[PDB]
Design a protein around this ligand. Structure first.
Ligand SMILES: Cc1ccc(S(=O)(=O)Nc2ccc(Oc3ccccc3)cc2C(=O)O)cc1
Length: 559
């Protein structure tokens, strides 16, 4: 059937939309070619709609069914608990879109009488009505990018706040535990960046002659069929569930997950959806399961040997045993045709890779640098173009989420996050006298509140002390970073080094945690290095819950 149906009503904004980077004294010191930075707006909504609207084709075979049974078997070991209204409310972000029933996020987090009572009626409704399609709002997402040698806005579909709270009650535990139970080491969200690298590298080393490839599905959400979603539910149903949870999952599946009506910001019937909605709790878990299911089955059909999958939502990377150049290319092609039959056609044609550093997955790749002792150390990196464009936008405007903080945390070892993001933002936080102020950022979609001053401990725990001493980066990584700086008009190393030494001195003179930020975060900027010993507070950090599951679009806040 058609992934979408359109009435003709337009996808409308809910207020003025900013598309250009404001000329700002601070963002200008980070990146000079401000005209290359833009934010998508609903003005490109029509371009996106045309791309995600099409009739899906799906043909299932014995491999698909075999893998599904294997998956259901593992799901059978799980026991999901069901959250109380109180617990679900606590998971709601303070900035989550308000309900249309007289209350907002704050009321939800504060267990307000009106919010709680409405949520209860919505839950009871899920238990009683098993068919009425649940209403959803559709909006053009506002994201920042750098022009290319432009990207139309993505579309986000989400239900009301009341319904979102109910989703948590019925499925939060499910989506946080089942993927790992079912997919094991292949579930990407269980790994911190360091752990992901370790998994990728160890997997690559376990092969006689390794071959790997990333698979980009063309607009994955729209390729998800009604069948995929019911298959997905069938997996969840293998869990031991409370009666009410079981019914809520059944109702939520038929009333919301498989599709439903689309309403714009003005309250106008925009159309109908028959594919994956981006803004629901099950989106990450659902896409991961579906991608893993089709890919694992496709690998068998294609006869790829000893495959090892790493899946993060719709992002997939496969590493297998090479059977030779011609054969690998033929097997990959067979893989793609199998995936196409499963309704997961490729966007970018896949290509076999024999060099791990050249494989991009989750917009990132593994690369090598060296610590003070000279030992090779692997770490996760990526082209810094988008991260920098966003750092610049976030420096000029006030944004709910601070992608820059998230990028420093996740890419602490990289040459660009250290030289640029750390230097730029600490210099600004110092001046504005806001080093103590906790800021929100996202990690695998979930929102977190983090104080800049704890970055040293955070980085040591997550990446190890070598994150503060890496040097001699790969020629490929250096060329990529350099060409990026020239493109965006970003100051050269010498300028950043000078600014870093200055920021570093100001931090040291302050003592306390600030000085700790000076010593570790900026040791790369001075010649007379300082002995960097284990940070006490790093051995007392509970960062486990950071890498458990994916929640993009799930409206999840972890306090
Ligand atoms: C965090 C960081 C770590 C080490 C340094 S360094 O000055 O000690 N060494 C380098 C200096 C320049 C360079 O190549 C670049 C070219 C353009 C832009 C940035 C770096 C690469 C390296 C390195 O250690 O590999 C600078 C920044």
């Amino acid at each position: 059937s058609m992934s979408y149906t359109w009435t003709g009503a337009l996808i409308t904004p809910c207020a003025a939309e900013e598309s250009k980077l404001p000329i700002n004294p601070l963002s200008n010191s980070l990146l000079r070619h401000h005209n290359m930075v833009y934010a998508t707006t609903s003005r490109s909504a029509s371009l996106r709609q045309k791309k995600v609207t099409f009739d899906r084709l799906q043909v299932l075979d014995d491999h698909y069914r075999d893998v599904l049974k294997e998956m259901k078997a593992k799901a059978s070991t799980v026991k999901a608990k069901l959250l109380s209204i109180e617990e679900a409310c606590k998971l709601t972000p303070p900035h989550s879109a308000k309900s249309k029933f007289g209350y907002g996020a704050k009321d939800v987090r504060n267990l307000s009488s009106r919010a709680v009572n409405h949520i209860r009626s919505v839950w009871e409704d899920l238990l009683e009505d098993t068919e009425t399609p649940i209403d959803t709002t559709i909006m053009a997402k506002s994201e920042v990018f750098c022009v290319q040698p432009r990207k139309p806005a993505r579309l986000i579909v989400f239900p009301d706040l009341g319904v979102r709270v109910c989703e948590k009650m019925a499925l939060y535990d499910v989506v946080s535990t089942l993927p790992q139970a079912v997919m094991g080491s292949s579930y990407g969200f269980q790994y911190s960046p360091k752990q992901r690298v370790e998994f990728l590298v160890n997997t690559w080393k376990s092969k006689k002659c390794p071959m790997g490839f990333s698979y980009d599905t063309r607009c994955f959400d729209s390729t998800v069929t009604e069948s995929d979603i019911r298959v997905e539910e069938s997996i969840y149903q293998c869990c031991d569930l409370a009666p009410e949870a079981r019914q809520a999952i059944r109702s939520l599946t038929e009333r919301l997950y498989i599709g439903g009506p689309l309403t714009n910001s003005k309250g106008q019937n925009c159309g109908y959806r028959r594919c994956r909605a981006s803004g629901v709790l099950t989106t990450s878990c659902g896409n991961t399961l579906t991608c893993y299911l089709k890919a694992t089955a496709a690998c068998r059909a294609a006869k790829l040997q000893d495959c090892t999958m790493l899946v993060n939502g719709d992002d997939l990377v496969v590493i297998c045993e090479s059977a030779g150049t011609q054969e690998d290319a033929a097997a990959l092609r067979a893989f793609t045709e199998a995936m196409t039959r499963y309704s997961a056609p490729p966007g970018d044609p896949p290509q076999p890779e024999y060099d791990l550093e050249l494989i991009t997955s989750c917009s990132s790749n593994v690369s090598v640098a060296h610590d003070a002792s000279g030992k090779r150390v692997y770490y996760l990196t990526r082209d810094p173009t988008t991260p920098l464009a966003r750092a610049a936008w976030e420096t000029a405007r006030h944004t709910p989420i601070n992608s820059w903080l998230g990028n420093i945390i996740m890419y602490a070892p990289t040459l660009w996050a250290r030289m640029i993001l750390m230097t730029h933002f600490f210099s600004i936080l110092l001046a504005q006298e806001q080093l103590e102020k906790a800021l929100d950022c996202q990690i695998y979609g979930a929102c977190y509140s983090i104080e800049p001053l704890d970055l040293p401990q955070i980085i040591e725990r997550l990446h190890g002390l070598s994150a503060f001493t890496l040097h001699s980066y790969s020629p490929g990584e250096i060329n990529r970073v350099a060409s990026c700086l020239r493109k965006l008009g970003v100051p050269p190393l010498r300028t950043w080094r000078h600014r870093a030494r200055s920021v570093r001195a100001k931090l040291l003179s302050q003592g306390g945690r600030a000085a700790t930020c000076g010593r570790y975060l900026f040791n790369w900027a001075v010649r007379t290095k300082l002995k960097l010993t284990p940070i006490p507070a790093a051995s007392q950090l509970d960062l486990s819950g950071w890498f458990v599951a994916g929640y993009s679009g799930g409206d999840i806040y972890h306090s």
